[PDB]
């Protein structure tokens, strides 16, 4: 799938052909639109001193 | 002049490439045209026509070569029968669908 | 007056809408075999272990490098017996070998 074809918001559903289920299932896999872009904030949490005592 | 009885058989539920038989017994006169369809589209090749036998009535059958993958995906195989200008259609699908 | 093969049992069943006519409706069962030589097969129908002696018509064996043949059979059944989940078996006797194929309408 082209990169430009995914950002346009198209319905890409896959189908299966199995003998147990006569009716194929459809799974809607589409990227939701209208969302915003937020800069992620990375924080590092050092381990507490209560764990280093156990060694 | 009587209307032929169109009957299309289906493969068993517990498995069986299978074949499709469209019987048109108890029909008159002897000439009869039998074709096959696939999801509303014409079929070029992949089927044969057995010679008409004698059961006065006759017996005409047709064999279609299909696949297991293309049969359990909600596909309609209509047996179009043209008899004395009358087009007979029989839409079939999966019983367990 | 040298090809020895085994028959392939193929049983056809009516669909959920294959019954027609005045009540009770009736249908047909077809048991065909292809790609086998010689052809000692005798058409026999078994309904839940009971031998059927009426309602069947054995058509003559036609002709389809080994020489293969094909046999087409027809058995008259009833809609009432089909709703009771009755297993139909097409008995095949090829050179003494017994071939069975149990079919039903269970999904």
Q: How was this structure determined?
A: cryo-EM
B39: exposed, middle or buried (C-beta count within 10 Å: 0-12, 13-18, 19+)? Answer: exposed
Does A19 sit within 8 Å of B74, measured CB to CB?
no
The helix (run of H) or strand (run of E) holding residue C70 is strand C69-70
User: Closest Cα partner for B6 from B29, B28, B34, B41?
Assistant: B34
CA-based radius of gyration for chain C: 15
Our measurement of the distance from residue B76's CA atom to the centroid of its chain's CA atoms, rounded to an integer in Å, reads 11
Residues 28-67 of C with CB under 8 A from B: 28, 30, 32, 59, 62
Q: A37-49 burial, b if ≥16 CB within 10 A, otherwise e?
A: eeeeeeeeeeeee
Would an 8 Å CB–CB cutoff place C87 in contact with chain B? Answer: no
Identify the structural domains of chain B with CATH numbers, from first to last.
1-97 (2.60.40.10)
Phi, psi of A50 (to 5 degrees): -75, -15
d(Cα A3, Cα A15) in Å, to the nearest integer?
22
d(Cα B46, Cα C59) in Å, to the nearest integer?
25
Asked if B33 contacts B12 with a C-beta cutoff of 8 angstroms, the reply is no
User: Roughly how many angstroms between the first and final C-alpha of chain A, as a whole number?
Assistant: 51
- Which residue blocks in A1-55 are alpha helix, DSSP H? 3-7, 49-52
Phi, psi of C73 (to 5 degrees): -120, 160
The label of the residue with tokens 């696949």 reads B67
The per-type count for chain C, helices as H runs and strands as E runs, is 1, 11
Tell me, in Å, the resolution of the deposited structure.
5.2
Closest approach of B96 to chain C, Cα-based (Å): 6
Does B14 sit within 8 Å of C20, measured CB to CB?
no
Residues 22-81 of B with CB under 8 A from A: 68-69, 72-74
Our measurement of the distance from residue C66's CA atom to the centroid of its chain's CA atoms, rounded to an integer in Å, reads 24
Q: For chain A, which residues lie within 8 Å of any Cβ of chain B, measuring from their own Cβ?
A: 15, 17-19, 22-24
Cα distances (Å, whole numbers) of residue C98 to A45, C32, C88: 75, 15, 15
Measured between beta carbons, the chain B residues lying within 8 angstroms of A22 are 72, 74, 94, 96-97
Strand, helix or coil for residue A19: coil
d(Cα B31, Cα B20) in Å, to the nearest integer?
21
Asked if C14 contacts B9 with a C-beta cutoff of 8 angstroms, the reply is yes
Strand, helix or coil for residue C47: strand
The beta-carbon neighbor of A19 closest among B68, B74, B97 is: B68
d(Cα B71, Cα C31) in Å, to the nearest integer?
20
Closest approach of A26 to chain B, Cα-based (Å): 12
In this structure, which long-range contacts are made by residues B38-45, counting pairs with CB atoms below 8 Å and at least 24 apart in sequence? Answer: B38/B75, B38/B77, B39/B75, B39/B76, B40/B76, B40/B78
User: Closest Cα partner for B93 from C11, C18, A15?
Assistant: C18
- Which residue blocks in chain B are alpha helix, DSSP H? none
d(Cα C82, Cα C88) in Å, to the nearest integer?
10
Give the tokens for residue A47: 């381990």
Measured between beta carbons, the chain A residues lying within 8 angstroms of B96 are 22
Which residue of C10, C15, C72, C101 is the best one to mutate when testing the B interface, meaning the one whose CB has the most B CBs within 10 A? C15
Give the tokens for residue C32: 């065909």
d(Cα B41, Cα B77) in Å, to the nearest integer?
10
How many C-beta atoms surround the C-beta of residue B50 within 10 A? Answer: 15
Residue C5's contacts (CB-CB under 8 Å, 6 or more residues apart) are C35, C36, C37, C66
Residue B5's contacts (CB-CB under 8 Å, 6 or more residues apart) are B23, B24, B25, B26, B27, C20
Q: Peptide bond before C86: cis, by omega within 30 degrees of 0?
A: no
């Amino acid at each position: 799938i082209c990169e430009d074809d995914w950002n346009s918001g198209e319905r890409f559903t896959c189908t299966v052909t199995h003998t147990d289920l006569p009716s194929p299932l459809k799974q809607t896999i589409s990227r939701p639109k209208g969302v915003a872009l937020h800069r992620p904030d990375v924080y590092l949490l050092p381990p507490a001193r209560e764990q280093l005592n156990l060694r | 002049e009587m209307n032929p009885n169109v009957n299309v058989f289906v493969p068993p539920r517990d498995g069986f490439k299978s074949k499709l038989i469209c019987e048109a017994t108890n029909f008159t006169p002897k000439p009869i045209t039998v074709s096959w369809l696939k999801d509303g589209k014409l079929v070029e090749s992949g089927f044969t026509t057995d010679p008409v036998t004698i059961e006065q009535t006759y017996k005409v059958i047709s064999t279609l070569t299909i696949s297991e993958i293309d049969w359990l995906n909600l596909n309609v195989y209509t047996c179009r029968v043209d008899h004395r200008g009358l087009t007979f259609l029989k839409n079939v699908s999966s019983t367990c669908a």
